[PDB]
Design a protein around this ligand. Structure first.
Ligand code: NA
Ligand code: NA
Ligand code: NA
Lengths: 420, 210
């Protein structure tokens, strides 16, 4: 039940604890940062504030101000006039409290506190220069195929899914891109439930009883249309268990002359089925690449009810850092509030949560110990429009707060998949 | 600039599909160089007469959260009854709807207007899946109000007795609508959970003749 592994390697939760237990509090009003000390006895005599303004991850301005705050006192810091951004996007202010001097308990340069705010946003209005290329639809009995240069997209008409993508003669998928509504259950999802003694109230058991893990997709609709500058695929699936419709997913895929595939997803969740663990897509990519680069919350694992410590910026980690090695394997490594994701030749854009690793949700849920896990062929990608809270108030009764349960009934998200 | 921002067209295209016509549009609402809102839409008119309207709105994070996200128009029709499957029968707003019940409601048009002595936005019904007015039916998941008074006349008129019925019927169909508040009436009182702060918004409607 620790914040750290037995060998004192931190769990991701430790950074959430560090951030919430900060001794300096911040408010922003215009150009002014107000710093409040929660120290009772000490003056801030080993603290300087670093501030940075970045436009979608690109540094614009930064500086340092020494902190001079009495215990329980306040200090106002006036930011200088900021150079206005050169392009569209969201400006972010990040502040960090740094300890210039070493102590008995810390190294020189120790970060003790941080906070972020959104500043001005300039919405992108200038339309991209229309590409001259036009994709071609090849229709057959079993497939809709779209070609553009060395690129090819294959949609199986029997299943309704993007089953394959080609860049040259290279296949990009090991598994079709399919909707996913389940997660390898966390310890909080399971609680005290056991095979020999089922706890019907635990989330995992409600999901199991409702048929969430065994639900089969039935194709309702699969059509193709040619537009002036794009190809449009429309699909609708129903997920059912024992004649009961749990979920309906309606999608459009729009492939244009730039080779960008715009995916729109609209999901209905039956109101009497237990709220699902996630609403997203998944596939097994053929590629194994060294780095994962993303614009979003990070760098560490963060979930919707545990993401206050994570910061919005441009992050770049080795693939292995995107997997959290919990001794009991479960859903892990999610990053939220992500606008762009990069892996090998691929780029995904939108407003999503994701995890990426060599382990499928299926393997994570069937394996009781981390040392028994094996890297699968390629790379498993889970991209979620929505993900349920992880909870934790306790680990023996449902503890995910109502505002983090996926109870809205209808959900919309949108993604653009393209080659970098 | 919310009340004075003018729609600027960014894109308007039409494509003929196998069994439909697709109109795709994009607009920006700007005030003194600043883009406040972007609206992206598709209208899909199929061979059964139904028009499917899909709307995706972006709201600048640094603009004050808008009062509503929806569409409006003045219908030529003046009909006697309003029939809806949604919350009611009375006026209800997102932070004042617990008393409303979901059912099939049918009222005279006049009951869809609340005669507040100081005129304002009024008569919204939330959680509506189907709206019927004359030959028109709208389906989806929306909030609506419907009356002989435009939002403009309401905001320009200070006493209910000075209001005059306009030609036809003003319909406001909202995907989203801000809370009304009321903890007090001398400082902003709409709670964070009822402010339209999500940045991106999606709603869809089907318009047909029944
Ligand atoms: Na100091
Ligand atoms: Na497991
Ligand atoms: Na008025």
């Amino acid at each position: 039940n620790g914040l750290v592994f037995a060998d004192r390697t931190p769990h991701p939760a430790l950074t959430e604890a560090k951030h919430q237990q900060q001794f300096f509090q911040f408010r922003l009003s215009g150009q002014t940062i107000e710093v409040t000390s929660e120290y009772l006895f000490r003056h801030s005599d080993n603290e300087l504030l670093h501030w940075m303004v970045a436009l979608d991850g690109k540094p614009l301005a930064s500086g340092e101000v020494p902190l001079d705050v009495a215990p329980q006192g306040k200090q106002l810091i006036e930011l200088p006039e900021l150079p206005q951004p050169e392009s569209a996007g969201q400006l972010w202010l990040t502040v960090r409290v740094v300890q210039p001097n070493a102590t008995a308990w810390s190294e020189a340069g120790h970060i003790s506190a941080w906070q972020q705010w959104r500043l001005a946003e300039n919405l992108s209005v200038t339309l991209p220069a229309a590409s001259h290329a036009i994709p071609h639809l090849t229709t057959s009995e079993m497939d809709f195929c779209i070609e553009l240069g060395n690129k090819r997209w294959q949609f199986n008409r029997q299943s309704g899914f993007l089953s394959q993508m080609w860049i040259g003669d290279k296949k990009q998928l090991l598994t079709p891109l399919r909707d996913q509504f389940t997660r390898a259950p966390l310890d909080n999802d399971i609680g005290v439930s056991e095979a020999t003694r089922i706890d019907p109230n635990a989330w995992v058991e409600r999901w199991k009883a409702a048929g969430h893990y065994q639900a089969e997709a039935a194709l309702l609709q699969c059509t193709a249309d040619t537009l002036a500058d794009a190809v449009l695929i429309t699909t609708a699936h129903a997920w059912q268990h024992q004649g009961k419709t749990l979920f309906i997913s309606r999608k459009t895929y729009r492939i244009d002359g730039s080779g960008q595939m715009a995916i729109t997803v609209d999901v209905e969740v039956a109101s009497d089925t237990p709220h699902p663990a996630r609403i997203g897509l998944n596939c097994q990519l053929a590629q194994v690449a060294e780095r994962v680069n993303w614009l979003g919350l990070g760098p560490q694992e963060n979930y919707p009810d545990r993401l206050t410590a994570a910061c919005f910026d441009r992050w770049d980690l080795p693939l292995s850092d995107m997997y959290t090695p919990y001794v009991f394997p479960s859903e892990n490594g999610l990053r939220c509030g992500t606008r762009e994701l990069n892996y090998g030749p691929h780029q995904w854009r939108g407003d999503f949560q994701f995890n990426i690793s060599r382990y499928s949700q299926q393997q994570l849920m069937e394996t009781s110990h981390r040392h028994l896990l094996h890297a699968e062929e390629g790379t498993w990608l889970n991209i979620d429009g929505f993900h349920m809270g992880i909870g934790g108030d306790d680990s023996w009764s449902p503890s995910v707060s109502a505002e983090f349960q996926l109870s809205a009934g209808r959900y919309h998200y949108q993604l653009v998949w393209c080659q970098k």
